[PDB]
Design an enzyme around this catalytic site. Structure first.
Site, mmCIF file in Angstrom:
data_model
loop_
_atom_site.group_PDB
_atom_site.id
_atom_site.type_symbol
_atom_site.label_atom_id
_atom_site.label_comp_id
_atom_site.label_asym_id
_atom_site.label_seq_id
_atom_site.Cartn_x
_atom_site.Cartn_y
_atom_site.Cartn_z
ATOM 1 N N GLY A 259 0.786 -1.233 0.000
ATOM 2 C CA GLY A 259 0.000 0.000 0.000
ATOM 3 C C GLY A 259 0.816 1.281 0.000
ATOM 4 O O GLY A 259 1.931 1.311 -0.538
ATOM 5 N N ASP B 61 11.842 -3.025 12.004
ATOM 6 C CA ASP B 61 12.327 -2.092 10.971
ATOM 7 C C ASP B 61 12.568 -0.691 11.533
ATOM 8 O O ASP B 61 12.190 0.318 10.929
ATOM 9 C CB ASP B 61 11.407 -2.088 9.732
ATOM 10 C CG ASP B 61 12.078 -1.550 8.465
ATOM 11 O OD1 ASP B 61 13.331 -1.608 8.378
ATOM 12 O OD2 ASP B 61 11.351 -1.093 7.558
#
Ligand SMILES: CC(C)(O)[C@]12CN(c3cc(-n4ncc5ccc(-c6ccn[nH]6)cc54)ncn3)[C@H](C1)C2
Length: 258
Positions: free
Chosen positions: A14, A117
């Site tokens: 997305g 991350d």
């Protein structure tokens, strides 16, 4: 009800847009996902979040196959944009952001979530420059019912990943997030990343293992924060400093002003 104004950041699935309400002008961040297993998990994690140093999640709306994820807009922008290339930032600002980063990571680890991350593009700032850990697309459960689960999937961003992630079939989640926080601290204090990846084929990583701290980025860093980085950027994750011990570090506890 909402108008898409500008792209805020990117990801594996997305896109994240700045959305302005057509009636109230309220500006929010919206993640728009096309098409199911990955989004259900992400929504689940986003629903668990309640801490000052994690991005606030408003809720979600589904329209056909399209999923919309609403989050509080970080008016201070990203930590990435506070890092001057090849310089970094003033040590007191870096220490404050590092204290807040530790606060957010302790919170996530405490609820058994690993971010996977951590990097300056995923660390955002509110109106008062409070750091907020963003983007839970790669986040996962590493502890459930007080039982730890080892990670067995490679993900993240190469300059920020711990070396065990490249070498081991399975590995503990918490030392991986500790490592990426160490690369973030290096970026904040030197305005440059130390290596493309923590592998033997990478000369800059070999040089760090050989204690060549007379080289960049290390020579830009004061002895006190460098001593902390020597404890974080430890190859063997079982020997790597834990967050309770980072909180005891001399530089972590050093009074700094401006
Ligand atoms: C200067 C300017 C144009 O007015 C700014 C720059 N800003 C921001 C905000 C955000 N936000 N805010 C919330 C939020 C949630 C997730 C993510 C994200 C990043 C990666 N994956 N998900 C990004 C998000 N990102 C970047 N810059 C605000 C608009 C100030």
């Amino acid at each position: 009800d909402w108008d898409l104004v500008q792209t805020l950041g990117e990801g594996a699935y997305g896109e994240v847009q700045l959305a302005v309400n057509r009636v109230t002008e309220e500006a929010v961040a919206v993640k728009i996902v096309d098409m199911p297993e990955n989004i259900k998990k992400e929504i689940c994690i986003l629903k668990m979040l309640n801490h000052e140093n994690v991005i606030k999640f408003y809720g979600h709306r589904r329209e056909g196959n399209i999923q919309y994820l609403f989050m509080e807009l970080a008016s201070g922008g990203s930590l990435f944009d506070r890092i001057e290339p090849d310089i970094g930032m003033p040590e007191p600002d870096a220490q404050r952001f590092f204290h807040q980063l530790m606060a957010g990571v302790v919170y996530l680890h405490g609820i058994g979530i690993t971010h996977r991350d951590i990097k300056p593009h995923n660390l955002l700032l509110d109106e008062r420059d409070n750091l907020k850990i963003a983007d839970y697309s790669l986040a996962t459960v590493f502890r459930y019912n007080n039982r730890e689960r080892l990670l067995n999937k490679m993900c993240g961003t190469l300059p920020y990943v711990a070396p065990e992630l490249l070498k081991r079939r399975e590995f503990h989640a918490e030392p991986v997030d500790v490592w990426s926080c160490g690369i973030v601290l290096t970026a904040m204090l030197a305005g440059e990343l130390p290596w493309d990846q923590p592998s033997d084929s990478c000369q800059e990583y070999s040089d760090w293992k050989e204690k060549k701290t007379y080289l960049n980025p290390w020579k830009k860093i004061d002895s006190a924060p460098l001593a902390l980085l020597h404890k974080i950027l430890v190859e063997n994750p079982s020997a790597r400093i834990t967050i309770p011990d980072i909180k005891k570090d001399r530089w972590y506890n050093k009074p700094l002003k401006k």
